[model samples]
Target: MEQKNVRNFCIIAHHGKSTLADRLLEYTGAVKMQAVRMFYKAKDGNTYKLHLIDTPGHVDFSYEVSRALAACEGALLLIDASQGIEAQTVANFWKAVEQDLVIIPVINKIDLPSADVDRVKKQIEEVLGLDPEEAILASAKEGIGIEEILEAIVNRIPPPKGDPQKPLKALIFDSYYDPYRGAVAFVRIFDGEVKPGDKIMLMSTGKEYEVTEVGAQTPKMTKFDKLSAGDVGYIAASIKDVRDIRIGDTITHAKNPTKEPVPGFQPAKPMVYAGIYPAEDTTYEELRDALEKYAINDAAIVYEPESSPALGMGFRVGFLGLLHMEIVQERLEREYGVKIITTAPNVIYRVKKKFTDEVIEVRNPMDFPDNAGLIEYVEEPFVLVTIITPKEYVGPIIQLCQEKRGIQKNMTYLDPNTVYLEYEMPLSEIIVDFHDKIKSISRGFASYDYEFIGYRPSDLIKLTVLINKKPVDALSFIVHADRAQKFARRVAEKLRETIPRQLFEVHIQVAKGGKVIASERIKPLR
Candidate 1:
C-alpha cells in the first residue's frame, strides 16, 4: 500500500538499550518508510511512509542533530511539555527554523501526570513565533493525534519540488555499496521520473549507475514501471563502487543531461574529531578501508591517513558530534571486530596565515606549530544554547555559565517557575558531558538545547598537556587566554588526573611557544 501523497520522516531516539523511535515506527507502521530519514530507509510500510530518522538521544551525538535535519524538509519537532523544551530541544528547534522547514510541533509526554500541554504549546508558539492554535499535540505512546498529525504532514508539508522535464535530477541522501548491487543509491526523485533498467549518470562522480532495482523504502520492493518526479525510492544500479556514489549526489539521464551539478552544495561537514588506531601495523589498511565503507552509510565522517610516534600509520577520524563518534567506534569494534587505542575528542580548527592562500585544517594539536605566524584566524564552532528550567535554581545556573566563560545571550520567563536562559557557548565546552551538569544544577528540572551558530573569533588558546616533555596535541584545544592564570591550578589538576602517571617524571608544562606560561609536575599516581 504505497501512499503517493505522504512521505513519513523523523529522527530515531535511543531511550535506553533500544531506540524509542524504533517502537514508534512499529506502532505507527512507519518502520522503514523511505521518505526522508536515512536510518529508516530499509524498514517496512509504504502507504504514509515515515521519513523517520533514528537519532542519538544521548548528549554527545551533536553532529547528528543537524545532519538528520538536512535530509528532511521538516521535522516532527518534539518537545517534552512536561519539561517545556530544554537545551537539546531548543537547539533542535533552531535547526528546523534556520533550515526553513515545516515543523509539525509535537508536545510529547501528554500522558504524564505533570504534563502541561497548554504551557508547552504556548512556549513553542513564543519560541518559534507561531500561533498557539497552529501547533500539533501528540502522544506517541497512547497513539493520540497520530492520524491527525499524519494528515497535517501530508496537507502542510510541501511536496518535493524540482523541474521534472529536465534530466533526471534525483537526490542521493544515502548510499551503500553492495558486492552484487554495486552502489545502491537511496534517493528521492526531485525532478524527472526514473525506472528500472534506466541508465542514469550521477552528476557528482560522473559515473553511470544503471537502475537495476527501483522501489519504495517501506521494504515494499514494488517494481515501478517508472518512478515519477517527487518520488523517493532506492536505485540498485549495480554501481558497486560506493566511493563513486557520494551522498547528496544528483542523478540525471545520461542521454538528456543537466548543465552541471548544482553549485554551493558542499558535502556534509564533519564536526567532532577522534583518532582511530589499528590493532597493529598490519591491520592499518584494513581499518582505513573499513572506515570508508562505514562512511557510505554515514555521510558526515571525515578522516585522513595519520601516523604518531607511538600509534604508527593509523587514521584519525572526525564525526558530526559525540554520538556519531561513538557509533563509528562501536561499529568498528563490533562489526569489524578490531581492537585499538582511542584518544579524546578534539575539534577541527580553521587556521590561516598572513603569507599564502593556504588554509591549514588543524586536526591534531601537533599540527599547530607553537611558532605559527600571527595566528591570523583561529575559528571554533559556536552554538546558541537555550535552557528551560524551574526558576528556583536560576541563580546557580547563571553562575555556572560565568564559570564556563559562556556569554549570557537572553533570558525569558516562560511561566511562574520555568525560566528560559539563552547563552553563547563554544562547542568544546559542551562536548564533554554538558547535559548532565545542566540537569544537576537545575535539580533535574532543566532542559537545554545546543545548535551550531557559526565559527566565531574566540579568545581561547590551546593548552597542550605534555607527558615526559612531549606535546600530546590530541588533548589540546583553543580556550580563552584570560583563563591561563585563573585555571592554572584546576587545569593542572585535570591534566594530573587525566594523563596517566608514567614511571618517569611527567613534566606538565603549558606553553604558548618556547615560553612555559604555566608549569606543573607530578610523579606516577600509583
Candidate 2:
C-alpha cells in the first residue's frame, strides 16, 4: 500500500463506540469481541490498512482516549442524537482537536423514536463547530451508515505521517504482562520496521531487548513477519517485568537509533487517593502482591505501604479519579480473587507549616494534623465541573451544586430543551457522592465531567472518630465546615450499626480535631 493509502483512525464515542468497533471488526473477519485497539480490512480490497481505536467515554478513562488519539491520524466523533451531545461528547471533541486528529462527526442512534436529527445537527454545528451538512447519521445497531463511515475513514482521514524507510521508532500506547509471553507491548509503528530477532531500545526507559515475536490483534494475535511504519501491532521481547515496558514509551532500533523519540510519551498521574485493605482474615501480603500485579497492566495505578489501626495493614492507593478507584477495586475482587475494604476517598492537600514556608503533602486522614493550629494554612484540590442536562433539571442541579460548595462559572443553552452548566468546586465535595446527587436531582437526564484545577486555600477542619474509646485514624477525615457535623453524624450512625456488640459498651464518637461533635453508643451483648 502507498504511504497515503493507510487509514488509521479511532472512534471517540459516547453511548456506543464498542458496538460500532465490534461490527467494524466482524465485517473484516475478526471474532467474538475484543479490546478496543483492532484492525480492519476494507471490502474494496486491502488498499489501506484500517485500524479502529475504540475509546472509553467515562471520565476516569479519559487517559485511554488520548493515548489512542496519539496513535491515529483521525477520529470518528460519535454523538447520540437522542442524548444530544452529553458532557463526554464535548470533552472527547476537545481532546480530538488537541491531538490534531481529523474529526468526522457521526450522529448515532437515528433509529430511535427520540432521535432529534435536526436538533443534534445544530449541536454539532454549535458545540463542536462542525458543519451540520457534513454530519453522518448512523445507527450502529441497525447497520445504518456503516458503509459511509468506512468510506469516510478512507477518504477523509489521512494516512500515518512518517517515513517508512526511516530508522525504527514505535509508540507503545498500551501493554500488559503475560505470564507465559512476558511483557507484551501493543505499539503503533511511526517510522520504522520491527520483527522477531530485531534488537529494540525503549527510548524513555533506556531498556534494551531482543524482539521474541511480532503480531497483529486481528482481534486475536496473528503472527506477522514484520510490522513497518503505519502498522499497529504487538511485540513480545521476553521482558518478564511489566515495569520495564511502560505504556507511552517509545520503541526504537537498538543499532540504528532515532535522534528523537515520539512525542506525548509520559506516565499517567494518579489524581484521587484512598486506602485499600484486604477483607477479614486475609493477609496484607496477599493484597500487596495483588495490587502489584494489577498495576502492571494499569500503569496509572500508584500504591504504597500504609498502616491503619482500625482497618489493619493496607496500601494507600492512588487513581485518576472516582471511576478509576471503583474500576481498580472491582478488578481486584473480580480478576484477582481478593476482597477488600476501602476507606473514604480523599484528595492530596498542601499543608504549609506556620512561618517556615515548608509545605507538606497530606494525602490521607491518618497523616492529617491532629491539631488545627499545627498548620499555618491548608489548600485543597478543586475541579472545573461541566454539566449538560435538560432545562427542567437546571434549578435542582444548581441547588445541588450550591450544597456541595460549587461556584457557578457560566451556563449556556444549546437549544430549547438542553443546557450546559459549568462550575468550580473543591474536589473533596464532588468525591463525596456529588455525582449520585446530580443524577438523583436531574432524574438521570444529566451528564457531567470534571478536571482537577489545582489547590486553593480553604477553611478546612479534620473530622476524627473515636472507636471503643481509641482514635481510629482510618475513620478520620478532613471536611469543609458546612458538612463536617452532618457527615460526622452519618459516620457515627453507620458505625453503630456495623460494629459488633462488645463484652462491654462501645462508644463511637465523631469529633473535630480533638473536640467531640457527635457520639453514639452500642450496647454490650448480655
Candidate 3:
C-alpha cells in the first residue's frame, strides 16, 4: 500500500546546521542527539514507510537548498529568536517563498536564555506575512514540544496526491551502484504504483530499465510487491553502470507514461571549480576513482580531466561553492583516505560565440578560444546576505563587508541590542573564503546568505603561482585588483599549508594586468 497520509518535506534551512535544526525538530519534534537525527516514514503491514528529505544549511551547500525546496511541499523556516534571521535565512526564505511552499516560520532555541520568541515571530510575520505559530517554544535538548511539531507536520503540510493506478510516475532523487547489487534507483512515487519485476522507463533520459527489486528505506531494504502513489522507496535494476541512473528523472511504466518527464530538470551544473592534483603521481588513479565514486552519489559534483603546464595531469572538480569545495577536499582525504593538492577555488564562466549566442563553459583560461566573443563579460554570482549581531559590532561588521565588496543593501534592529543586516555581494568573494574572515570580525554572531543575483562585468584575472618561476596551475587564483593585497596574504597562508615539505622554493604573487601588487617566496626545504 502506498502511504499517502504523511507529507514529504525537507528541512530547507538556511545553508547551515542551526536553521535545519529549527525545521527538523519543528516537523518531527525530535531533538538532535549527539549531532545526528534519524528520519522515519509512515508504515503499513510488514512495512515501515515515510516521505522525508534532509538538507544542508550552509553557503557552500546552499545549492542543495534549491533541490530540497523544489521537491518539497512546504518549508519549515527556522529563525533564532535572539539573533533574528541570518543572511542565509533571507536567501533561503526568498527561495522558499518563490517556490510558493507554505512557510511555517519556526523560531527555534526558544528556551535559550537569550531567545525572544515574540519578537522573532512578529519580525517574520512582518517580513513574510506569515501567521506562524508562536515560535514553538522548546529546548531541543530536553525534547520539549517535539510532539506538537510532528502533529503540525501531519496537520499542516499536505502529502503527495495523485492516482496510484495512473502511469507509474516516480521522481528519482537519488541512485547508486554496488558491484554486488548492480544499480539501485531511489525514487518517490508521485503518481502511480511501481512493483517488483515491472518494466520501467526513465522519461527525461529516455532510457528503459527494469525494476528487479522493490523496497522502502527505514531505510533498510525490505521486500514489497509494489510501492503505490505518494511514497518514497528504492528499486534496483542490476543495470551494470552507475551513470545509467540520473537524479531528478521520472520512472514510469513502459506501457504508459506521462506526457512529459518530471519538470524543472536541469543538468547538474557546478559553479565553482578547482584543480585537484595529487602530490604524488601514484595517487592519481586512486584520487580519480575516489572522486568518481563520490560523484556517483553526490549530484552536485562535476569532475573532468585536464592537464596543466604546472600541475601536470589532474581532475578539475566543480562544486556548488567554496565551502563545498573545501568539504569535498576534506572528505576526499578523510572518507576516501586519498590526499589531494588543491588549487584555489574559482567560478566557471562562459566563453561563447558572439554570433551564436551560446554559453561555452570554460573552466581553464587556456581553453578559451583565441578570441572568444569579446571575453563576453565575466560572470560572477552574487548573494543577498543578512546578518544579525549585537549593536556594538555593527560598525565592524559593515566595514568588514565593504572590504569584501559587499554593498550595504539594508539594515534594521531586531531589538535594542541585536540588529539584522543585509548585504549584496559577489558569490566569487564568498567562494574564496573572504566571508569567513568577515564572520571573524563580528564575534561569530553574524550570519548571512546570498541568492544567485545576476552577474556583472568584472575585470577579473587569474594569477598563477610559480615555484622557482615554474607556473603551478594548481596554485592559481582569480581576483579583482581592488582586494588583491588582502586576499594575497590569506592565500599565501593557505598555500603554505597546502604544499607539502617541498624541497624547492615556493613563490607567491598577486597581479593584475601583468602588474604584480604583492609577492613573496618561501625558502627551499632540504
Candidate 4:
C-alpha cells in the first residue's frame, strides 16, 4: 500500500473514546464488536486505509494512552457534549499536543437531552483554547454526524510520511503473548518494509528473531504479504519469552538497521505498591503462574516474592494506580481462576537518615526504619492534581482538598458554570479514597487527573498493629504524624470488632515507634 494513502490516528477523551471508535468501525463496516486497534479501507474517489486506535480513558491506563499517541500522526479529541471539557480531556489534549499530533476537536453524545452544546463549545474554547466552530458534533449511539466525522478524518488528518526504501523502523507500541504464536508485537511502521522471513532485532535488547508471519487487524488477523511505511500491523516472531517483546521498543532490520532507534520511548513506571497473597485454596505456584501469564499482556506490573508472618508467602506487586490494582485482581480471578488477597496500597517514600544524611526510597512499611531517632526526616511523594467540576461545588471541593492537606495552586472559572482547580497534595492521600470522595461530594459531576510532582519533606510515622501482644507485619503501614493517633484508634476499634473472642483474653493494640497509642481488649469465651 502507498504510504500517502494510509491515515494513522487515535481517539482520546475522558470518556466515550471507545464508543466513538466502535461507531466509526461499525460505520466503516470494519467490525461489529469492540476493538482496541483496528484498520479498514475507505473508498470515496480514492481508497484510503484508516487505522484507529482506541485508548483507555481512565488515568490508570495513561501509559497505554501515551503508547497509542506515539504510534499515530493525528488524533480525534473526543468530548462528551453533556460533560464538556473534563480533567482527563485536558490532560490527553496536552499529551497529543506534546506529540505534535494534529488534533480534531470532537463533541460527542449531542443527542442527549442534558447536552448543552453551546456551553460545551464555549468551555472548549475557553479551557482547551481550541476553536469551537471547528469542533465536530456527533452522537456515537445514534450515528448522528457519523459521515461528517469520517469525512473530517479522511480530509483533515494528514497521511503518515515515511520512506519505504529505508531500513525497517517500526515501533512496538503494544504486544501480547499467544499460546500458539509465542509473542506478537503490534507495530506502526514508520520507514521501510517488513514481511515474513525478515530478520528483526529489538533495538533496546539487541535480540534478533525471525518473523514467522505478519498481519493486519481488519478487526481480525488477516495475513499480509508485506507491511510497509505508515502501515499498522502485527508481527509474529517465534519469541518464546514474553519479556523480550518490550512495549515502546523500536524494531529494525538486523542486517540493515536504522541509523538510530525511535525517540521518546520510555518504560511505564508503577505508582502504587501492594502485597498480593494467594488464598487458602490457591497455591503460591498457581498465583505465580497466573501473574506471569497476566504480565505478558500488562507490562506495567512489577512484582517480587515477599514473605509475611501472618500471610506466609506473597508477592509485592506494583501497579500504576488503585484502579489498575483492582483490574489486575479481578482479571486474575476471572481469567486465571486464581483467588488472592490484596493488602492496602501505598506510594513510594523517601527516608532521610540523621548521621549519614543519606536518602533511601521505601515502598513497604516493613522496610521502614524502626528506630525513629536514627531518621532525620521523611519525604513523601506529592502530585499536582487537576479537577474540573461544576462551579457550585468549588467550595466543598476546596474544603476537601484542605482536609487532605492539599496546597491550592490555582483555581479558574472555565466559564460561568465550570470550575477548574489545581492543587499539590501528597500522593498517599489520593491513592485510596480521594477520587471516590470527590465524586460523592460533587454529586458525580467532577472529574480529576493527577501526576507526580516530587517528594516533599513530611512528618511521617510507621503505625503497627499488635494482636495478643504480637506484631502483625501485614497490618503495619506508614501514616502522617498528625493523624497517627486517630488512625491508630480506628484500626484498634476495627480489629476489636472483627477478631473473635479467644479461649483466654485477646488484646488488639496499635503502636507507633514501639509505644502503644491505642488498645482494645476482647474477653475470653466461656
Model 1 lDDT tens row, 254-301? 888777663324456777787778874438878877887677665567
Supply every candidate's count of residue pairs whose N, Cα or C atoms clash at under 3 angstroms: 30, 0, 17, 0
lDDT of 1 at 335: 79
Runs in model 4 with CA error above 4 Å?
30-44, 354-358, 497-506, 521-526
Q: Over the stretch 1-526, how does candidate 2's per-residue lDDT look in tens digits?
A: 5666777888887668777776676665642221233434456666566766545667776766687778888988888888889998898889889988999998889999999899989999888888999888888667888778877888788888887789999988777777777878878888989999999999988889999998776777777898888887789989876667776778998999988987877677777899999996668988888898788777678888898777788999999889899999999888888879998899888888776567998888778777688788889988899999999999999998998899999999988889999999999888988888889888888999987788899988888899877898887888887888888998899989987898899999998867899999998887
TM-score of each: 0.78, 0.93, 0.81, 0.93
User: For residues 363-478, could you state the per-residue lDDT of candidate 3 as single tens digits?
Assistant: 76445444423555556567676776778888988887787788987888765677778788877776665566767877687766556676666656555555554555556666
lDDT of 4 by residue, 51-118 (tens): 87656667887766787788898889888888888899999999898888988888878899999899
Predicted structure 4: lDDT: 0.84
lDDT of 3 at 58: 75
TM-score of 2: 0.93
Top TM-score: which candidate number? 4
Q: Lowest summed lDDT over 10 consecutive residues: which window, candidate 4?
A: 30-39
Please give the distance, in angstroms, between residue 411's alpha carbon in candidate 3 and its true position after superposition: 3.7
